[PDB]
Amino acid sequence: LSGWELNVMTVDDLQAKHQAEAHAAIDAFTKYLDIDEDFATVLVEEGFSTLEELAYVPMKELLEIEGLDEPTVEALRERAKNALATIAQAQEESLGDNKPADDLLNLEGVDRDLAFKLAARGVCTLEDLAEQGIDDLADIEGLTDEKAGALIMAARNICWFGDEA
C-alpha cells in the first residue's frame, strides 16, 4: 500500500539499538549514577565507550567537566579494571553451552572435540544428535558419512533402538 518498504523488528526493546545505542547500556552508567543522582548525570560530550584511550586525556577533559573528580576517575579506573575483567569473564561465559556429558562424551567415536563439533552446529543434548540424519549432521569439520552414520546409530540405540534414555 505505502510503496515504502517496511521493517518490523520491535518498538520497545531492540529499537533504540538503531539510534539510541550508545546511550543505552544500563549497567555501567546507572551503576555510576545511583550515587551521582545527587551530583549530576554523566558527560556525554565525549563518547568514552572505548574508555581506554579517551581516558588518557589530560586535565583539559577533567577540568572542563565536573563529577568525574580525580579520586572519582581513579576509583572508576579500578572499576574499569573490574569492567575489562568483566568483558573477559563474559568472553569466558559465552563459551559455555556445548554440553559435554557422559551421555555425549564416552560414546563410540566421540572425543571431547566431537562434542565441541556436534554442539558447534548447535547440539546441546544427546536427543538432538538423534534428531538428524547424515545429510543434516554434515558440513562438520572432520566428520565423514560413515562416522556420523555410526554415531547416529549409537544415538538411536541409546535412545530409539533400546527405546530408552
Binding site: E127, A130, E131, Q132, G133, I134, D135, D136, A138, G149, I152, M153, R156, C159, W160, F161, D163
Partner: protein
C-alpha cells in the same frame, strides 16, 4: 541455490500444465505411458535449456548420464500412476536436485489442487509462501498415519498386516493415497503426522524425504539406519511420532 530451484519449478509448472491439460480428455495402460513419456520429454528438453550436463535419473531408463557428474536430477513426472489411470485427481510431479550423493533441492507439485512444495537445506520448505512446520504431535493418540501397501511386493503383507494391527491399536486412524511423494508432502505440511512404506524406490521419495527433513522432520529405514536410500522401507515424520511408531513397529522386522 536460487537458480537451480528456478529451473526446477519451471520444469515442474510446465509438466503439470501438460498433465492437467491432457487430463481434461476422456477415456474409459497405454494412455498413461504416453503422457508419462511426453511429460518426461518436455521436462528434460526444458532442462537442457540450462545445464544440459547434469545426470538425470528417471524411473524408466535407469540413469541418463551426462558430462557434468556433479549434480543428479531425480525425476518422476508421475507417481502413483494408478490415480491417473482411474481418474482419481491425486498425483504430483516430483523433481529432486541432488549433489555428491545427497540432495539439495526438492520440488513436488500437484497440478489438480495446484499445490507446490519447495524445499532446500537451511532455507526450509515452503508451500507457495509458507514457512512449513510439520505437525505438532508428540505421541500416537489422535494421530494420523499416511500408510502404504505393497501393491508389487505383497510378501511382507502378513507381517505388514501385523504392523497395521498393532499400529491400529496405538494410533487414531490411517490414510492411503497411493502417491508416496504426496504422503511425504503431507507429512511436511503436517497434514498427516507420520509416514511409512515398505520397499519404495529413490526416484519417487527422493524429493519427499528432503521435504519432510527440511520441514523439521527426519526419515529412517525400518531398522533405524540409513539404507533406505537403497531399501525404500521408509519411516518419516517429526522425531516424536517417529519414535512413537518405531518403538512399536521394529519388533516385527522382516527386511
Amino acid at each position: 541455490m536460487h537458480p537451480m530451484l528456478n529451473i526446477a519449478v519451471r520444469a515442474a509448472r510446465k509438466a503439470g500444465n501438460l498433465i492437467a491439460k491432457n487430463y481434461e480428455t476422456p477415456d474409459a495402460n497405454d494412455f498413461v505411458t504416453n503422457v508419462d513419456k511426453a511429460a518426461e520429454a518436455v521436462i528434460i528438453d526444458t532442462i537442457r535449456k540450462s545445464y544440459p550436463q547434469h545426470t538425470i535419473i528417471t524411473e524408466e531408463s535407469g540413469e541418463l548420464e551426462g558430462t557434468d557428474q556433479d549434480v543428479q536430477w531425480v525425476i518422476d513426472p508421475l507417481d502413483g500412476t494408478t490415480n491417473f489411470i482411474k481418474r482419481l485427481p491425486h498425483f504430483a510431479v516430483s523433481i529432486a536436485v541432488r549433489i555428491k550423493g545427497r540432495t539439495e533441492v526438492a520440488v513436488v507439485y500437484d497440478p489438480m489442487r495446484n499445490e507446490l512444495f519447495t524445499a532446500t537445506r537451511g532455507q526450509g520448505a515452503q508451500l507457495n509462501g509458507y514457512r512449513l512446520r510439520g505437525s505438532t504431535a508428540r505421541d500416537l493418540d489422535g494421530t494420523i498415519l499416511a500408510t502404504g501397501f505393497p501393491f508389487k511386493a505383497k510378501q511382507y503383507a502378513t507381517t505388514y498386516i501385523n504392523i497395521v494391527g498393532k499400529l491400529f491399536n496405538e494410533c487414531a486412524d490411517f490414510r492411503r493415497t497411493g502417491s508416496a511423494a504426496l504422503d511425504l508432502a503431507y507429512v511436511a505440511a503436517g497434514r498427516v503426522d507420520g509416514f511409512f512404506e515398505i520397499g519404495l524406490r529413490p526416484w519417487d521419495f527422493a524429493a519427499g524425504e528432503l521435504l519432510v527433513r527440511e520441514a523439521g522432520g527426519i526419515v529412517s529405514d525400518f531398522t533405524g539406519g540409513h539404507n533406505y536410500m537403497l531399501t525404500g522401507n521408509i519411516v518419516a515424520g517429526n522425531p516424536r511420532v517417529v519414535k512413537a511408531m518405531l518403538a512399536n513397529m521394529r519388533d516385527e522386522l522382516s527386511d
